[PDB]
Amino acid sequence: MRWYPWLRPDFEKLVASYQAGRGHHALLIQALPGMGDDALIYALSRYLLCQQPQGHKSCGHCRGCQLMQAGTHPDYYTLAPEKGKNTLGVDAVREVTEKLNEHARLGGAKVVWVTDAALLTDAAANALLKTLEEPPAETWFFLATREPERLLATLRSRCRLHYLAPPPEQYAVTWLSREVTMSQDALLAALRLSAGSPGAALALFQGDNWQARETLCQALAYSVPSGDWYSLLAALNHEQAPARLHWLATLLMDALKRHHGAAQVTNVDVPGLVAELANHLSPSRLQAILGDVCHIREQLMSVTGINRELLITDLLLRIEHYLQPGVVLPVPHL
Amino acid sequence: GPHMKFTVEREHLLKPLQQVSGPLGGRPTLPILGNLLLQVADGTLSLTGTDLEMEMVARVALVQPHEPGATTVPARKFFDICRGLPEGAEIAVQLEGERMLVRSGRSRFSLSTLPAADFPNLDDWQSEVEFTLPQATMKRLIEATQFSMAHQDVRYYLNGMLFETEGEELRTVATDGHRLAVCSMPIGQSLPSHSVIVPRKGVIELMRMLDGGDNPLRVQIGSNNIRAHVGDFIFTSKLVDGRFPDYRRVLPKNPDKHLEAGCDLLKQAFARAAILSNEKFRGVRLYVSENQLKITANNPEQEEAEEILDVTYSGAEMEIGFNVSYVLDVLNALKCENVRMMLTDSVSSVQIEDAASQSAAYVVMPMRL
Amino acid sequence: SYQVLARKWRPQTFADVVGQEHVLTALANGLSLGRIHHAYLFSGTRGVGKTSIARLLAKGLNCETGITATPCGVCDNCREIEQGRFVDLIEIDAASRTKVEDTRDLLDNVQYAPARGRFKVYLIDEVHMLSRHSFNALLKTLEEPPEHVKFLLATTDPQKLPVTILSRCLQFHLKALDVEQIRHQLEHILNEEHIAHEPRALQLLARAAEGSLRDALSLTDQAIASGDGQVSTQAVSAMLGTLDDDQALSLVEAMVEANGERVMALINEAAARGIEWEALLVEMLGLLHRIAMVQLSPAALGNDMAAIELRMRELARTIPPTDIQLYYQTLLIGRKELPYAPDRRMGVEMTLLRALAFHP
Amino acid sequence: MSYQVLARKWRPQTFADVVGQEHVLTALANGLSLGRIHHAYLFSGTRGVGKTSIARLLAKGLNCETGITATPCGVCDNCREIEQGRFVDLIEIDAASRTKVEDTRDLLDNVQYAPARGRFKVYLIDEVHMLSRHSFNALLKTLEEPPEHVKFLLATTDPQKLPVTILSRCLQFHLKALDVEQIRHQLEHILNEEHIAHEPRALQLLARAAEGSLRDALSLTDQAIASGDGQVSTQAVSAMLGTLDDDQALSLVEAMVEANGERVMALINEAAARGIEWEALLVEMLGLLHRIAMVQLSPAALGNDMAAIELRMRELARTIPPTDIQLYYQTLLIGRKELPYAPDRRMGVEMTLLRALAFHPRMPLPE
Amino acid sequence: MSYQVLARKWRPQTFADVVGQEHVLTALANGLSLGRIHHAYLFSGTRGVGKTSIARLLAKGLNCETGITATPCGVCDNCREIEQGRFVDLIEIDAASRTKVEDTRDLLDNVQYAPARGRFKVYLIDEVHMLSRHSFNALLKTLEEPPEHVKFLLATTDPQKLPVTILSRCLQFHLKALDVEQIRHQLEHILNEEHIAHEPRALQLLARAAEGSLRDALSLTDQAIASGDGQVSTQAVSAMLGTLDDDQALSLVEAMVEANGERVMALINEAAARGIEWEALLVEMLGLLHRIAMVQLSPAALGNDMAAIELRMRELARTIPPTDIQLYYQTLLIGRKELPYAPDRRMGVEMTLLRALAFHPR
DNA sequence: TTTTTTTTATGTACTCGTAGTGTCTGC
DNA sequence: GCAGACACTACGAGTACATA
Ligand SMILES: Nc1ncnc2c1ncn2[C@@H]1O[C@H](COP(=O)(O)OP(=O)(O)O)[C@@H](O)[C@H]1O
Ligand SMILES: Nc1ncnc2c1ncn2[C@@H]1O[C@H](COP(=O)(O)OP(=O)(O)O)[C@@H](O)[C@H]1O
Numbered sequence A: 001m002r003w004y005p006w007l008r009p010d011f012e013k014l015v016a017s018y019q020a021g022r023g024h025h026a027l028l029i030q031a032l033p034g035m036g037d038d039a040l041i042y043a044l045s046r047y048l049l050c051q052q053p054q055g056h057k058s059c060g061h062c063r064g065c066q067l068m069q070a071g072t073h074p075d076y077y078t079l080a081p082e083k084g085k086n087t088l089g090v091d092a093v094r095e096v097t098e099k100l101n102e103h104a105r106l107g108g109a110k111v112v113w114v115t116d117a118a119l120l121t122d123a124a125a126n127a128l129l130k131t132l133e134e135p136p137a138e139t140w141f142f143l144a145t146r147e148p149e150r151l152l153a154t155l156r157s158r159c160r161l162h163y164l165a166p167p168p169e170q171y172a173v174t175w176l177s178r179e180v181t182m183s184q185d186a187l188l189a190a191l192r193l194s195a196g197s198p199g200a201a202l203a204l205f206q207g208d209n210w211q212a213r214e215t216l217c218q219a220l221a222y223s224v225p226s227g228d229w230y231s232l233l234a235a236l237n238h239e240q241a242p243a244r245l246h247w248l249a250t251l252l253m254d255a256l257k258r259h260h261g262a263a264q265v266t267n268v269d270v271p272g273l274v275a276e277l278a279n280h281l282s283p284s285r286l287q288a289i290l291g292d293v294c295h296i297r298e299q300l301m302s303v304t305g306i307n308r309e310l311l312i313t314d315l316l317l318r319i320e321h322y323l324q325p326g327v328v329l330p331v332p333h334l
Numbered sequence B: 001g002p003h004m005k006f007t008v009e010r011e012h013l014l015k016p017l018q019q020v021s022g023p024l025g026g027r028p029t030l031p032i033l034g035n036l037l038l039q040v041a042d043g044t045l046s047l048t049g050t051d052l053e054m055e056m057v058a059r060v061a062l063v064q065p066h067e068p069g070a071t072t073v074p075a076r077k078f079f080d081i082c083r084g085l086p087e088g089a090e091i092a093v094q095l096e097g098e099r100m101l102v103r104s105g106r107s108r109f110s111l112s113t114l115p116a117a118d119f120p121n122l123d124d125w126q127s128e129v130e131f132t133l134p135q136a137t138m139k140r141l142i143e144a145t146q147f148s149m150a151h152q153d154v155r156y157y158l159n160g161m162l163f164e165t166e167g168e169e170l171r172t173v174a175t176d177g178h179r180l181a182v183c184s185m186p187i188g189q190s191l192p193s194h195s196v197i198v199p200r201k202g203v204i205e206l207m208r209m210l211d212g213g214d215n216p217l218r219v220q221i222g223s224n225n226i227r228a229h230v231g232d233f234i235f236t237s238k239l240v241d242g243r244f245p246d247y248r249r250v251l252p253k254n255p256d257k258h259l260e261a262g263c264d265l266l267k268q269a270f271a272r273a274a275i276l277s278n279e280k281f282r283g284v285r286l287y288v289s290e291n292q293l294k295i296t297a298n299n300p301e302q303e304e305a306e307e308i309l310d311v312t313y314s315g316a317e318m319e320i321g322f323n324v325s326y327v328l329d330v331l332n333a334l335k336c337e338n339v340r341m342m343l344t345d346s347v348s349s350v351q352i353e354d355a356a357s358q359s360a361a362y363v364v365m366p367m368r369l
Numbered sequence C: 001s002y003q004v005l006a007r008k009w010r011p012q013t014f015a016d017v018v019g020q021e022h023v024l025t026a027l028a029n030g031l032s033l034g035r036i037h038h039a040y041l042f043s044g045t046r047g048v049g050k051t052s053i054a055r056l057l058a059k060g061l062n063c064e065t066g067i068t069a070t071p072c073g074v075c076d077n078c079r080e081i082e083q084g085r086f087v088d089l090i091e092i093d094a095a096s097r098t099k100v101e102d103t104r105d106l107l108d109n110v111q112y113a114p115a116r117g118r119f120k121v122y123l124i125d126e127v128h129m130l131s132r133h134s135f136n137a138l139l140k141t142l143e144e145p146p147e148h149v150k151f152l153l154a155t156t157d158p159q160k161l162p163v164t165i166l167s168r169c170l171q172f173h174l175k176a177l178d179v180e181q182i183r184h185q186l187e188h189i190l191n192e193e194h195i196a197h198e199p200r201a202l203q204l205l206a207r208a209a210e211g212s213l214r215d216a217l218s219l220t221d222q223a224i225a226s227g228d229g230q231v232s233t234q235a236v237s238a239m240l241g242t243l244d245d246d247q248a249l250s251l252v253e254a255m256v257e258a259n260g261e262r263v264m265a266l267i268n269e270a271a272a273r274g275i276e277w278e279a280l281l282v283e284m285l286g287l288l289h290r291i292a293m294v295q296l297s298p299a300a301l302g303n304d305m306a307a308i309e310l311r312m313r314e315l316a317r318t319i320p321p322t323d324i325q326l327y328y329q330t331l332l333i334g335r336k337e338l339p340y341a342p343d344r345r346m347g348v349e350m351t352l353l354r355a356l357a358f359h360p
Numbered sequence D: 001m002s003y004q005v006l007a008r009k010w011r012p013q014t015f016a017d018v019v020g021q022e023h024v025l026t027a028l029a030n031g032l033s034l035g036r037i038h039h040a041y042l043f044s045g046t047r048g049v050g051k052t053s054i055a056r057l058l059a060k061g062l063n064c065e066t067g068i069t070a071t072p073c074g075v076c077d078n079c080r081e082i083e084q085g086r087f088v089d090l091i092e093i094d095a096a097s098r099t100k101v102e103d104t105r106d107l108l109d110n111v112q113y114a115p116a117r118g119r120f121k122v123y124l125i126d127e128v129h130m131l132s133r134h135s136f137n138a139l140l141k142t143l144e145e146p147p148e149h150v151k152f153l154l155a156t157t158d159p160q161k162l163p164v165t166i167l168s169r170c171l172q173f174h175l176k177a178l179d180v181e182q183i184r185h186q187l188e189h190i191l192n193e194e195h196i197a198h199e200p201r202a203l204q205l206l207a208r209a210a211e212g213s214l215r216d217a218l219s220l221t222d223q224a225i226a227s228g229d230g231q232v233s234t235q236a237v238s239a240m241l242g243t244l245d246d247d248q249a250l251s252l253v254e255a256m257v258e259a260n261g262e263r264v265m266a267l268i269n270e271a272a273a274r275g276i277e278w279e280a281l282l283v284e285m286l287g288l289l290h291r292i293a294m295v296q297l298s299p300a301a302l303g304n305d306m307a308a309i310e311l312r313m314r315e316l317a318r319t320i321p322p323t324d325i326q327l328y329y330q331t332l333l334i335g336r337k338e339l340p341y342a343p344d345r346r347m348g349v350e351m352t353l354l355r356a357l358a359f360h361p362r363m364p365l366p367e
Numbered sequence E: 001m002s003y004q005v006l007a008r009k010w011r012p013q014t015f016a017d018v019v020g021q022e023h024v025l026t027a028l029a030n031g032l033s034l035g036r037i038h039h040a041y042l043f044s045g046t047r048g049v050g051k052t053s054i055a056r057l058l059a060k061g062l063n064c065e066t067g068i069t070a071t072p073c074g075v076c077d078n079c080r081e082i083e084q085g086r087f088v089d090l091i092e093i094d095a096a097s098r099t100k101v102e103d104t105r106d107l108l109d110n111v112q113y114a115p116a117r118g119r120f121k122v123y124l125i126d127e128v129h130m131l132s133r134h135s136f137n138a139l140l141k142t143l144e145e146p147p148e149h150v151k152f153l154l155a156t157t158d159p160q161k162l163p164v165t166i167l168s169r170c171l172q173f174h175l176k177a178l179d180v181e182q183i184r185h186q187l188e189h190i191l192n193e194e195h196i197a198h199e200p201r202a203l204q205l206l207a208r209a210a211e212g213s214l215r216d217a218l219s220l221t222d223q224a225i226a227s228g229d230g231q232v233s234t235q236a237v238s239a240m241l242g243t244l245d246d247d248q249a250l251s252l253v254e255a256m257v258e259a260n261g262e263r264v265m266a267l268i269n270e271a272a273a274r275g276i277e278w279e280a281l282l283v284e285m286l287g288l289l290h291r292i293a294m295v296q297l298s299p300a301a302l303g304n305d306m307a308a309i310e311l312r313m314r315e316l317a318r319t320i321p322p323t324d325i326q327l328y329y330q331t332l333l334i335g336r337k338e339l340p341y342a343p344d345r346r347m348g349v350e351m352t353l354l355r356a357l358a359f360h361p362r
Numbered sequence F: 001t002t003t004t005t006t007t008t009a010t011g012t013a014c015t016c017g018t019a020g021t022g023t024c025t026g027c
Numbered sequence G: 001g002c003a004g005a006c007a008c009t010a011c012g013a014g015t016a017c018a019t020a
């Protein structure tokens, strides 16, 4: 958690709406992961819950700010998946809803914030529906998603939406280079892979993701000219398998797009690699491999508890089958 | 820490120790929570216990040498060891090496202790509204409605009961959504208007507090804390927010149909009728004719039960069907000589009152149409 | 409820609801005559009004005047329903009381006579989330309830409902609201709230609501909170991510000509200007639809198609309808799969690559 | 006097008033006449075809005053309470409300006590497929060798949920869903007895709308009566159902197979003026295509409810190849798949029709 | 008058009145006639095949006044008494009702008392697979050192639900599901011992539809007599079974492979007269085609699950080339994929079957 | 010999251990 | 008067199982 400069306008606007008593109780943030998703929600919640003598800033002396910094306030509910789970169960939602009918202990307003509204199971969202539509007078909600459409349609209606604009790419590169010391092309590539959203591109360098990406690039450089797509299984099977699959998908998209001679490339840090991908693979084969990789990535994320070893191994075996001449490629279908 | 050297007479210890050990009990949520703190300052020993939403303080006087200090002991073990001792025997308690040695005659016992700083305290509130009332007064005030409050329900905060102070009168109400009980009575002091909800556990402890027709109890009411003083006994508890429905609207305003009966006769008739009623739906139906009340009860095994009682009634037949446990409880509580039933309609609720007193009233909703 | 729309603007009389002529007529005729029922089931998509019509029926049933078609208005046993100080009514959000134990508790408290009013009305909202055992528990009571109780059921969809529960209830299907009805209601609200509004921005809001009125109200509130506290065409256009230029048609032409570098530079420039991708795809489908319509008759040039007639005319002359249908199908599949993509931009890229490969 | 729901006012009160289900009625009446009374009956079948009503009628026949009579002799004393539902001995058990075994145990404890008034203490266990497994196992033995003065009537929708060891020791009567003609005739009787005017086409639409049930049909008829001014008229039924009668969609399919786009779009505009759901138009057209396929395969496949257009049906049955029918059906089925994702539902339906037109294998659009 | 149900009045009373299952009757006869009697017999079977009846017969034999014999006399006061419900030494425990250990203790403490009348106090615990874990522990403690005067008789439907330790101390007799011929023979005897006319084809249909259990056969016989006006005719039983048929899958796939359009239409109409989820019907039809294609590869593919429809299935496997089965599976799969979006589920499944029927023949 | 073992979100029962309450008696 | 003695009712947990 850290503050971002580009969050300052949105924050101000939204808080300016809240101070007048006109802001909607149910706010749905569209911020991309790594963007000012949690920082904005925390800032707004801290402003709302405690007193506001200083205006839109933080009055750290008041007991409300003290409880926020201690993280022990009773009227600041957080909906998060537990350590041992991934989705957000309906039991926590039901319990928080029952707790909401209780009047505020401190006599101030109430705030209920969900860490990520996409993680809700259908029952959880349905349970929230009634409280979102008709909440107690002291209550304000805050939702966080990457994709509003992935949410339940009825819940996506009751909650007023709000969008965070990704910063211009030059501004993003300027901000990233300040505290991250990498090459300009590598920095641009990391920014583009994260859909222009900082933090996530910063997260690629801060964590161990970048070394994994480089290992993946080396493995592709070894595999593509030989048609031996196996031995990629080691570079792909991981707790971040969707992210590395997305990296592979970006590489394939870059190859296919450069085949048409497009101006800009998603993967600029490794022009030789994408050039090799263009050389050794037919455009139809590249398109089929890209489609299959994206589909299996969606399979990995959607269904829960699926053994990834089997899925990535099957994907690689099917890719090796595709590279063989005289093989019918699949057709995208409804 | 220091060496206690507290010498306490058993007669001046057993009863206050039982008083302070009342609220605690069962398996606590966490350790230390089940414990009690004894603290001696300038010849006065205070026994304090808590549930972190309740507190008990008992003050006793000491004449023997000592030192000012506070120590914690497990409650049940100390209560059981102090009792059963020979009558008039002094108890000498002394702290060595993080343990408590208790001595009586040639009897020695060692108990594990905790630092006094590990015993939490409750909140503080000032400018509490003060009350001076007789013990048995508030005793029967709550007793008329102690059964009324619903236990373990989500609706409102029915796990408790409402005190309302208006003018010079204190009124107390409880309900469940099907039965409601009110009891209003003039105290004798200039009082403001207040409405508070005391929790069910606090109600039980308040009943446990009352003892003797001696020095009057002193209430200190607030918004989130309640206090009671009975002699050298001090009790504190935490209140409940929210508010009950308007009892005034609950009471029927058209008691057109009247019935006068004997308390004991009606109670015995209802007790007999309840035997053959449905085990879960303990409902009987009532036919009201001139100076006659007939009660009919059924159950899945049939076994129809009928009874007839002489009353003072004039009007038409109503055929009011309602639960038996409720009416049996209220008739148990009345202990009066005569009972007034008040009926409005075959769909309307019914009102139960003392014939010779208006201090307490009750209402019960019907069962089936 | 300070200034939140669609909460302080809940309908309170049958004359105030928007559309729903068939449902309102049926309910009014039932109330006026003796034709009353013990299980009404209002089903329809989001924000068409299920709960509101339910509450209006409840107010009409329990009014002091009696069984009346139009609710009275000023009275105690209607204002209590409006404020939620109700005792003859029972609102249960079934999505929270899914447990069969709570449903059996409800069935246990069905015989008790109401404190006031002639009917104890159980409004079970979000019915389809009840667990199966709870549904079977409600089945018998719905079949033959006591004469003094009536059930009202509202669900986003009846498919999840067990078919027996359907066979127990009177089904009223709230049809989605057309563009004109939504626009009229929003203009009426804004006139009654003295808020500056512009007809074009109102049309964009009505179009983006997708036939659900609560969405229209929420989008109006988003516009009000944005901009300068008033509904204006520029602010609504900016916030909705709508496109009002010929970028869509240029993209269609480039994709038809399969000009890869140009057709990708167009998407890159669109991302630079930040055009929302779902709207861009929707307009692409609209333009292809206008192509197909023109191929039957040039009068199906959409009005005068702004001022770019020639282009689509030219396009309508150069591409066989088979390739147009192929492009439409590919674009629609891409729109379906667009949410299930790492990010919308690259999903639109996938859709464009799929569309370009048909020898365009 | 008063206006109560048809689904509860017109519940059959004798074996004469139960329409259809000839096999179950015949078997029950014959067995009661012969005196052979099994001690466990299980009425299965789809919802609203009379299993609960038949079970209550069987209770009437068993407990009637004059003896074990197949036909309940009108209304006798022991039948009045059955009709009113307050009978001393007919124990209605909402099994879904008593799934716990600690309630079936209480049911079994008092089974031996003699009936208060009736000959048998008929235990009518509604929704027997909802009892918990422990309660099932509990009632196994009491079903195997019950006392001579108790009978069990179990009614459920799907027998497969029940353990097979319970299906073994009870008679299995299966109630088939009623035919369209049965529902239409019963509805004509009901609307005649209510002194309400009605239209034959309206009642045919009511019969078709309900899937072989009756209480569903009665509910939809009551909703129609609400929608009309107390009359069941064809326009009111068309409005409430959302259907296209049998003419407009046939005009659509005839124009579409004729490759005349102009009339197709003209009727699309008219249907928009009719204020009708677009997916309803698509589903009606798909159903018409399927009916064409059915009559092409099976020469005699049209029911009476389509006779008004039957002739035109045969025309398409003699003019269009089966392959073209399959092509149209699959094209419009993908159109249905894609419609919720088109920019506008009207726009999507126009695109689906134009797609069926462009890939017309006989008269495709010129290139 | 009082016509007792055929499921009760025809319960066997001697080992000679028990049909088939000789592998258990002979074993019990040899054990009783000789001295070797185990301390606890556990009877197993499937859905009314003769577990409780054989257990009751064993209890009758153990305590007969003539002595422990394979054939009880049937005349002494004990035989008459156990014949009816009332008897002291034989304790019939509905274990499925008294599952709690609290009720089990009140009856397992009686072992310490002497038998009142007979040699052995016999505990017939029916539906033993239902006891609670603690009750199972109590019964195991009893069985560990059982008194010489007590014999335990346990009857159940699913032996594997029992904990392994209790099963290790019981001699388990598994009762075979009755064959069609034995069913038909016993049904003919039952009908002829009473006044019910019949036709042999009707009894053959009853036996085949009884799924190898005498209770099912007798229940169906009573239903047929009721609907048959006191005579079991072939047409009556056939029509009743048609009202009761559930295997629409195999018949419908037979018709579809043989390409009888009218038969497919009639079977769809019949499956619509019965409330049937079309998705379930289609998916299990896919399963039947899957099993057929498997049997194409190896005769051992058809396991013991589908023994009731083995012959037909084997025939369908033998007479049809595998390529047609693969094509039928493909078209049925694609039809089920698009099924929910069709006009109606009935409508869509109908046209899916038409699509599958248009190929190969016609 | 040998060690080897898996999706989950949610709901529904059943059965035993143990606390909290009532009452009722010979204390 | 009073524990105390059951006697009973409720609740948690361990476990089984259903559905999707
Ligand atoms: N027909 C309508 N007329 C007026 N307002 C409507 C209508 N339908 C929906 N709304 C608005 O939507 C809000 C929620 O409506 P509601 O009736 O709860 O929809 P639902 O059917 O989905 O429960 C209402 O507060 C009202 O502002
Ligand atoms: N066979 C039938 N004959 C006449 N009416 C029927 C029949 N089946 C259903 N109904 C109508 O449906 C109403 C309820 O039927 P019911 O027997 O409860 O169906 P279920 O089998 O689902 O319980 C009856 O009051 C009756 O009007």
Ligand SMILES: Nc1ncnc2c1ncn2[C@@H]1O[C@H](COP(=O)(O)OP(=O)(O)O)[C@@H](O)[C@H]1O
Residues within 6 Å of the ligand: E006, E007, E008, E009, E010, E011, E012, E017, E018, E019, E020, E021, E045, E046, E047, E048, E049, E050, E051, E052, E053, E054, E214, E215, E218
């Ligand atoms: N071997 C058999 N001989 C004769 N009848 C039998 C036999 N097995 C089952 N039956 C018939 O089935 C009825 C119930 O039999 P039962 O022995 O209770 O089966 P279960 O093994 O399931 O307890 C008996 O009344 C009898 O008619």
Ligand code: BEF
Residues within 6 Å of the ligand: A154, C044, C045, C046, C047, C048, C049, C050, C051, C154, C155, C156
């Ligand atoms: F939001 Be509604 F109840 F579908």
Ligand code: BEF
Residues within 6 Å of the ligand: C143, C164, C167, D046, D047, D048, D049, D052, D157, D215
């Ligand atoms: F009993 Be039925 F399903 F209405």
Ligand code: BEF
Residues within 6 Å of the ligand: D165, D168, E046, E047, E048, E049, E051, E052, E156, E157
């Ligand atoms: F009585 Be058996 F086990 F069906």
Ligand SMILES: [Mg+2]
Residues within 6 Å of the ligand: C050, C051, C125, C126, C154
């Ligand atoms: Mg709603």
Ligand SMILES: [Mg+2]
Residues within 6 Å of the ligand: C143, D051, D052, D126, D155
């Ligand atoms: Mg029923």
Ligand SMILES: [Mg+2]
Residues within 6 Å of the ligand: E051, E052, E053, E126, E155
């Ligand atoms: Mg048995």
Ligand SMILES: [Zn+2]
Residues within 6 Å of the ligand: A050, A051, A052, A058, A059, A060, A061, A062, A063, A064, A065
């Ligand atoms: Zn602050």
Ligand SMILES: [Zn+2]
Residues within 6 Å of the ligand: C062, C063, C064, C071, C072, C073, C074, C075, C076, C077, C078, C079
């Ligand atoms: Zn009113």
Ligand SMILES: [Zn+2]
Residues within 6 Å of the ligand: D060, D064, D065, D072, D073, D074, D075, D076, D077, D078, D079
């Ligand atoms: Zn009669």
Ligand SMILES: [Zn+2]
Residues within 6 Å of the ligand: E064, E065, E066, E072, E073, E074, E075, E076, E077, E078, E079
């Ligand atoms: Zn003998």
